[PDB]
A paper describes a structure:
Eukaryotic DNA replication initiates from genomic loci known as origins. At budding yeast origins like ARS1, a double hexamer (DH) of the MCM replicative helicase is assembled by origin recognition complex (ORC), Cdc6 and Cdt1 by sequential hexamer loading from two opposed ORC binding sites. During S-phase, each DH is converted into two active CMG (Cdc45–MCM–GINS) helicases, thereby initiating bidirectional DNA replication. Cyclin-dependent kinase (CDK) inhibits DH assembly, which prevents re-replication by restricting helicase loading to the G1 phase.
Here, we show that an intrinsically disordered region (IDR) in the Orc2 subunit promotes interaction between ORC and the first loaded, closed-ring MCM hexamer (the MCM–ORC (MO) intermediate). In MO, the MCM ring is closed and MCM subunits are primarily in a post-hydrolysis (ADP-bound) state, very similar to the DH11. Formation of MO requires Orc2 and Orc6 to bridge the N-terminal interface between the Mcm2 and Mcm5 subunits that form MCM’s DNA entry ‘gate’. Orc2 contains a long (235 amino acid) N-terminal extension that is predicted by AlphaFold14 to be intrinsically disordered. The Orc2 IDR has not been resolved in any ORC structure determined experimentally, including MO. Notably, overlaying our AlphaFold prediction with our previously determined structure of the MO intermediate places the region of the Orc2 N-terminal IDR (amino acids 190–231) into a contiguous stretch of density at the core of the MCM–ORC interface, suggesting that it may have a key role in MO formation. CDK-dependent phosphorylation of this IDR blocks MO formation and DH assembly. From these experiments, we conclude that the MO intermediate is critical for MCM loading when one of the ORC binding sites is of lower affinity, and, therefore, that the essential role of MO in DH assembly is to stabilize ORC binding at weak sites after first hexamer loading.
Numbering used by the authors:
A (entry chain 4): 177 to 212, 221 to 779, 793 to 838
B (entry chain 6): 103 to 194, 260 to 429, 441 to 463, 510 to 763
C (entry chain 7): 193 to 216, 220 to 507
The structure:
């Protein structure tokens, strides 16, 4: 019997059990968990990983929950994550060498023995924010889900406590013991005996890498009277430059505790221990929404490649799903099926939904040698009678988009939009905080009640809507940053109940140019009549008829997952270059519609590029101009007046 | 371990320096000139030698440098000792400096980790402040507290507190010491603040910054508000600002095991930041005579210049001419009383939105030697002008590099002119009435000098500019600031299909990646030198 | 000590005077001002309203110090706000040992218990004439930390105990003490919606309520009978209270089962009796004026917490 004091964990028994489970796991969860070809789920990763020289590996929890001989390992890695993982770091190499026994290989053995190994349990049991963590359940594997606010600099830590003897031309070496250094005051008595003659040098020693990340907690349930909170944590080396502001995150780690000094003067501490979290893994993507622009993050991609840390940054594809995508693109009913699928719970609003999907496509991202940049984003505005699904659509877009923020009415100011300067509550130093305009850098920006919002705030957007670059000049901060976010907002009519017989360009309580520069606008007038109302009424009542709208899937509605993966692949893989035929229709359509400024030309070209991106065309074609102009005219409803 | 390796490295490096000489024969085989380099250095007694990485790394297959770079400090004393030995060998009151420039690799501030400690590493960034020259403690004498015995040694980098050995060891307490000021050596010092560069920033990101320090004669090569390419070693310094943070904190303590019967523990807390040092820095960011001679001979080159300053923009020749003449300043020395003029000039434009006013801004800021793009609204006078520090970090204050304070002999392009506050327009009026500024806070007074030529963008009250009314009723800004302006421009559109078709043609053609539609007479490369030559012609 | 062997906290609750009357008191509902000074530590029951309570956090009660060489533990006990760590080896084996190998602490063996503070503010009707009320502080630990939420009627119970503070070192005469109270049990006349479990009698109450019939209009009638008529408006208020039904789309959206009402009309007729009765009866209620502190009083605020550095 071998055991750890105050513990029920065995080293060799756990090693044997781990090896047995590793050798025996073939989609056991597809059989036990549910009803859902392949073989040896786990073993492929370990077979492939050897030749690429990587000291990392991921790991699930459902697999241990499924396999017969890992249920007890479940609670033991739960309660004692660090100890169980230190065991696994040896068990993995044991299995590696016991699996090479059945193979003859070129002499690569110089590396594996000197190597190290580590794991990353990522998909684990759910946790209910931090309110659940009363002190009974400290120091345990945990999970969470929140966004990023603030990032700190690098904290070095004493890892090799070098030491310089003052005489006898001798150095000295000593290492850390549970996070402290005990300088040997002596001077190597044999050669010289000076009980307290030694020095310290920093350049010699080795240092660790640590960061601290301020995070905003976003739970799924909250009590009666809850409010947002902030937490601090700590990541360590090989994970630097991974998470930052503007990313939603599902994370894993270990809740912990620590006291703090009462001053920089003596050792007297607080009866209350400041809490924190130490990271184990970070999940940077999820299934219910697409991912970041790939061309926007090339530098970080290459940096991570060089650093040999390859946590997920973009979703991966399958050839069978690629073929399925090409098959689905063959049929011609895409152009309406996408609209029917974006929001099955709402009446048609066909052009509105079509424009939303084209915006999600985005469009073109070109650049010049040094003096140009043209990003894929077309500002959108809504307007019309209230009591419709405008707010519902906006909230849906905010949910489904990964990188965006919601702003409402006059509750906002220029200071709280662009960069603003504040102070930390612990370090008591001048630290900054990112603004909502920049937080959505690439994605969606949602506004509602665009009319009552203050003029001071309404001033800033003039340059955002053009060059996507905010500028800042205040205390100790002079830099121009990037705000590639997109704009998608609603507007309210002048007065109330609208005015049919009046020019709508003057019936909004909003100046001409601010409305004209919008790439496209949509109108939600009422036009009450049957054949458009009874159908809507049933459409919405059948939603409630069921406990949850799953019968809504009828009438040719796609699932979210394949739709999103198709969108992501199309966004990341194709680049339609402008063509020649579209010119003679685009120019004429623009000139004829002028009878109201040149910005609609940019709107039309950027939307036709998104249309070409749809259908997976690598080239524009004349037809997109036709759809763009026709939809613009229908959106403004030219026929009425 | 390097008690053996270091001297071998010294010998190998001095042999490297000696075996090479000045061959450079007919621009052929390049032999390293370090001998004559140190000779020419001894000509003026400067002792600030330079070294190039490529030549050093050529010989010995570069494994030498491979190990030296990561273990730089462990051998640096021996490197300087070998340099001294070579000086003794081949040349006839001695403090030296060294540097390594033209490194192959570049690391941003985010590309620095804890495995580059004491290792040479090239960085590039930006400057936002400087500091005060304060002579630093190179060597310093001490004396015994019971006699005149002087010790002319020094503990230099850190641990600058106490020597031990006394020439006459008969002393009740030889542990502590006295000090002295004159029998000592000193060398210059300077501090700056380094900053991120815009063209390499991530999303949701602030310009993460840190502090770097200089030494020796290489000082005076720093500059506020400029991009620079530093090179040095990963020095680190203590700090306590990192308190109150999670995790366990390392702490030092002398041992009390093995020897016994001898806060009593003398526990010292350790927690360090990662600053940087610089051995050398450079400012980042001929047949030209024949080129410019050929250019000048033409007559319509005026029109060529006018039309070449904004190919990315269409028409509006007035804006082109105004921007071309803005960079040129007028002679401000034309007085006899000593009361002076605002030699340079000012510009401003008007026009409804859906116009290309901002294109001119972005062009000029992306081409100007000195310039800055700011908000115009989201900015305080403290941001435009300089808000200074009040006796922080022990030393004295220092004048911050003001944003508007910048643009010395340059431009300060500012957008969104309508929404400016009251105080900021008051400050701009003060800065414009004279070519001087005055500041004060916490009792301190300041006096600056600058000749700024402002180009800004107007925004009428309602956006619509009533053609039948006067300028004042629509401009909405007080008479003094409205005045002092040499030029006013108006840019409003009208229905003209023949030209609008071609305008849309250009706009859509711009959506052809790096097309040839912007074919100018010539490029910024030679335009900048033309501007530099023309800035001082004195008509 | 025996403290670390304790697997059970304790939290008293005082008697209800209804039974103290049976056979024949000590603690009645009191005020933030009627302490009288002499009540330091006695059994008390104070009412009021909770304004701000910090988030729960751990606090040590017993230290776990293990010896590197002796391999034996040590129990350092702390009951004040601060202490000083035990570094040098005073171990029992080290006592009979020249060497004194250093010791350290544990992160799991050492005991812990939560610590959370709350503030009461006096109820309105019991304030004397033209008198501005004042505040008070309490301390909480362990289990009952979750039974407090701001804005509710409360009857706190415990004991009023002192603490080491003497003004701030200039306006002092010695022996001065800042004070606090102990939290041991919470009862509130307002039962939130989350406390609903049926029993052997409340179902009987519902049964006898529904037996009478005409329940809907009877509710509409019993809604604030101090005013006259407008059964339609009282019914509309009843349906506002009900709220509706919650439905989830499941496609990344839900919809509110919520109601919004207005009572536009000229003055003279009753207008505010409705709102006052609604705030009186409904839980989680709120009342506001029209103008005044509407700039940020209806919006999020920024503040540093007293008992711990944080931007709550
Ligand atoms: N139907 C009614 N029965 C009894 N009293 C009434 C009635 N209507 C109004 N009142 C009295 O008239 C006053 C009117 O005030 P109220 O309607 O509450 O606010 P407001 O002054 O804004 O209308 C109340 O104080 C109330 O006592
Ligand atoms: Zn020695
Ligand atoms: Zn002496
Ligand atoms: Zn001991």
């Amino acid at each position: 019997l071998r055991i750890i004091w105050g513990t029920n964990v065995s080293i060799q028994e756990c090693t044997t059990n781990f090896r047995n489970f590793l050798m025996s796991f073939k989609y056991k969860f597809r059989k036990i968990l549910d009803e859902r070809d392949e073989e040896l789920y786990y073993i492929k990763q370990l077979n492939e990983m050897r030749e690429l020289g990587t000291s990392n590996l991921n790991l699930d929890a459902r697999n241990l929950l499924a396999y017969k001989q890992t249920e007890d390992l479940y609670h033991q890695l739960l309660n004692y994550p660090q100890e169980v993982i230190s065991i696994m770091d040896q068990t993995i190499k044991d299995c590696m060498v016991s699996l090479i026994v059945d193979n003859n290989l070129d002499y690569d053995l110089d590396e594996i023995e000197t190597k190290f190994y580590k794991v990353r349990p990522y998909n684990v049991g759910s946790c209910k924010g931090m309110r659940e963590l009363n002190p009974n359940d400290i120091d345990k594997l945990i999970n969470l889900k929140g966004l990023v606010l603030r990032s700190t600099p690098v904290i070095p830590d004493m890892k090799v406590a070098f030491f310089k003897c003052n005489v006898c031309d001798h150095t000295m070496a000593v290492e850390i013991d549970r996070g402290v250094i005990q300088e040997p005051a002596r001077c190597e008595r044999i050669d010289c005996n000076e009980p307290n003659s030694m020095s310290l040098i920093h350049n010699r020693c080795s240092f660790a890498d640590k960061q601290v990340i301020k995070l905003q907690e976003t739970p799924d349930f909250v009590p009666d009277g809850q409010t947002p909170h902030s937490i601090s944590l700590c990541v360590y080396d090989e994970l630097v430059d991974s998470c930052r502001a503007g990313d939603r995150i599902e994370v894993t780690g270990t809740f912990r505790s620590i006291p703090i000094r009462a001053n920089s003067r003596q050792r007297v501490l607080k009866s209350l221990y400041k809490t924190y979290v130490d990271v184990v893994h970070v999940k940077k993507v999820s299934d219910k929404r697409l991912d970041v622009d790939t061309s926007t993050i090339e530098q970080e991609l290459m940096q991570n490649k060089v650093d040999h840390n390859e946590v997920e940054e973009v979703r991966q594809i399958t050839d069978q799903d690629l073929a399925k995508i090409r098959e689905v693109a063959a049929r011609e009913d895409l152009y309406s099926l996408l609209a029917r699928s974006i929001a099955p719970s709402i009446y048609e609003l066909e052009d509105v939904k079509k424009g939303i999907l084209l915006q999600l496509f985005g469009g073109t991202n070109k650049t010049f040698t040094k003096g140009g940049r043209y990003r894929g984003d077309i500002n959108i505005l809504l307007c019309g009678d209230p009591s419709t699904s405008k707010s519902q659509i906006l909230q849906y877009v905010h949910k489904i988009t990964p990188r965006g923020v919601y702003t409402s009415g006059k509750g906002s100011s220029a200071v709280g939009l662009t960069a603003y300067i504040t102070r930390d509550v612990d370090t008591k130093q001048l630290v900054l905080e990112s603004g909502a305009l920049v937080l959505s850098d690439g994605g969606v920006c949602c506004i509602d009640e665009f009319d009552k919002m203050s003029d001071s705030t309404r001033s800033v957007l003039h340059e955002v809507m053009e060059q996507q670059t905010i500028s800042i000049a205040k205390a100790g901060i002079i830099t121009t940053l990037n705000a590639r976010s997109s704009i998608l907002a609603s507007a309210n009519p002048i007065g109330s109940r609208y005015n049919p017989n009046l020019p709508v360009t003057e019936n909004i309580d909003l100046p001409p140019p601010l409305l004209s520069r919008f790439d496209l606008v949509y109108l939600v007038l009422d036009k009450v009549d049957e054949k458009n109302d009874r159908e809507l009424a049933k459409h919405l009542t059948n939603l409630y008829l069921e406990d949850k709208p799953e019968h809504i899937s009828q009438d040719d509605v796609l699932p979210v997952e394949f739709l999103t993966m198709y969108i992501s692949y199309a966004k990341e893989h194709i680049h339609p270059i402008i063509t020649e035929a579209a010119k003679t229709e685009l120019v004429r359509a623009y000139v004829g519609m002028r009878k109201a400024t040149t910005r609609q030309l940019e709107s039309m070209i950027r939307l036709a590029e998104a249309h070409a991106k749809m259908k997976l065309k690598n080239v524009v074609e004349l037809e997109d101009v036709q759809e763009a102009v026709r939809l613009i005219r229908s959106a403004i409803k030219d026929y009425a007046t | 371990v390097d008690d053996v390796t270091g001297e071998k490295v010294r010998e190998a490096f001095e042999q490297f320096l000696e075996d090479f000489s000045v061959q450079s024969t007919d621009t052929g085989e390049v032999e390293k000139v370090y001998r004559a380099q140190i000779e020419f250095m001894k000509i003026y007694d400067l002792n600030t030698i330079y070294i190039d990485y490529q030549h050093l790394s050529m010989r010995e297959n570069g494994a030498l440098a491979m190990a030296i770079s990561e273990q730089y400090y462990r051998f640096l004393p021996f490197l300087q000792k070998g340099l001294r030995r070579v000086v003794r060998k081949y040349a006839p009151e001695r403090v030296f400096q060294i540097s390594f420039f033209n490194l192959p690799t570049v690391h941003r501030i985010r590309d620095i980790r804890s495995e580059k400690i004491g290792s040479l590493l090239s960085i590039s960034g930006t400057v936002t402040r400087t500091s005060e020259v304060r002579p630093e403690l190179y060597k310093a004498s001490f004396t015994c507290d019971m006699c005149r015995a002087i010790v002319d040694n020094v503990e230099q980098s850190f641990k600058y507190t106490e020597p031990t050995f006394c020439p006459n060891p008969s002393c009740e307490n030889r542990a502590f010491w006295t000090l002295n000021v004159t029998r000592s050596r000193f060398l210059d010092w300077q501090k700056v603040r380094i900053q991120e560069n815009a063209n390499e920033i991530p999303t949701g990101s602030m310009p993460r910054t840190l502090d770097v320090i200089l030494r020796g004669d290489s000082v005076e090569r720093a500059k506020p508000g400029d991009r620079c390419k530093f090179t040095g070693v990963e020095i680190v310094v203590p700090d306590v600002t990192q308190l109150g943070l999670p995790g366990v904190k390392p702490s030092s303590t002398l041992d009390t095991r093995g020897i016994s019967k001898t806060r009593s523990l003398g526990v010292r807390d350790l927690t360090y930041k990662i600053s940087f040092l610089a051995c050398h820095v450079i400012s980042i960011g001929s047949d030209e005579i024949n080129e410019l001679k050929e250019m000048v001979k033409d007559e319509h080159i005026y029109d060529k210049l006018v039309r070449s300053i904004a190919p990315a923009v269409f028409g509006h020749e007035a804006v082109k001419k105004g921007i071309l003449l803005q960079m040129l300043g007028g002679v401000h020395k034309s007085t006899v009383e000593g009361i002076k003029l605002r030699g340079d000039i000012n510009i401003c434009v008007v026009g409804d939105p859906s116009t290309s006013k901002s294109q001119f801004l972005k062009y000029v800021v992306g081409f100007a030697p000195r310039s800055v793009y700011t908000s115009g609204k989201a900015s305080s006078a403290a941001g435009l002008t300089a808000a200074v520090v009040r006796d922080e970090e022990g030393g004295d204050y220092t004048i911050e590099a003001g944003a508007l304070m910048l643009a010395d002999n340059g431009i300060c392009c500012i957008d969104e002119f309508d929404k400016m506050d009251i105080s900021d327009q008051v400050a701009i009026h003060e800065a414009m009435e004279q070519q001087t500024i005055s500041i004060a806070k916490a009792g301190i007074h300041a006096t600056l000098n600058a000749r700024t030529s402002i180009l800004a963008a107007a925004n009428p009250v309602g956006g619509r500019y009533n053609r039948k009314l006067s300028l004042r009723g629509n401009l909405n800004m007080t008479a003094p600031i409205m005045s002092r302006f040499d030029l006013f421009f108006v840019i409003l559109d009208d229905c003209n299909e023949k030209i609008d078709t071609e305008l849309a043609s250009h706009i859509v053609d711009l959506h052809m990646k790096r097309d040839e539609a912007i074919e100018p007479p010539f490029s910024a490369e030679q335009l900048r030198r033309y501007i530099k030559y023309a800035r001082t012609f004195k008509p | 000590p025996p403290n670390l062997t304790r697997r059970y906290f304790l939290y008293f609750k005082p008697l209800s005077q209804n039974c103290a009357r049976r056979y024949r008191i000590s603690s009645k509902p009191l005020s933030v001002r009627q302490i009288k000074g002499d009540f330091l530590g006695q059994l008390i029951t104070v009412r009021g309203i909770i304004t701000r309570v910090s988030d729960v956090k751990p606090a040590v009660e017993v230290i776990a110090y293990t010896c590197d060489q002796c391999g034996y533990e040590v129990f350092q006990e702390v009951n004040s706000r601060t202490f000083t760590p035990l570094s040098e080896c005073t171990s029992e084996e080290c006592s009979q040992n020249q060497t004194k190998g250093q010791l350290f602490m544990s992160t799991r063996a050492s005991k812990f218990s939560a610590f959370q503070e709350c503030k009461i503010q006096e109820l309105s009707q019991q304030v004397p004439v033209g008198h501005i009320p004042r505040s008070l502080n309490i301390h909480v630990n362990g289990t009952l930390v979750r039974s407090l939420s701001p804005g509710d009627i409360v009857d706190v119970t415990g004991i009023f105990l002192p603490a080491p503070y003497t003004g701030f070192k200039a306006l002092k005469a010695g022996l001065l003490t800042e004070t606090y109270l102990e939290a041991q049990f919470v009862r509130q006349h307002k039962k939130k919606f989350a406390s609903f479990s049926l029993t052997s009698d409340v179902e009987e109450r519902v049964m006898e309520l529904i037996t009478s019939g005409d329940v809907y209009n009877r509710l509409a009638k019993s809604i604030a009978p101090e005013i006259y008529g407008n059964l339609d408006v009282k019914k509309a208020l009843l349906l506002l209270l009900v709220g509706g039904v919650d439905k989830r789309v499941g496609d990344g959206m839900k919809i509110r089962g919520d109601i919004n009402v207005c009572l536009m009309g000229d003055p003279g007729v009753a207008k505010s009796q409705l709102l006052k009765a609604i705030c009186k009866i409904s839980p989680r209620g709120v009342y506001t004026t029209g103008k005044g502190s509407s700039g940020v009083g209806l919006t999020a605020a920024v503040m540093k917490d007293p008992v711990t550095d944080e931007m709550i």
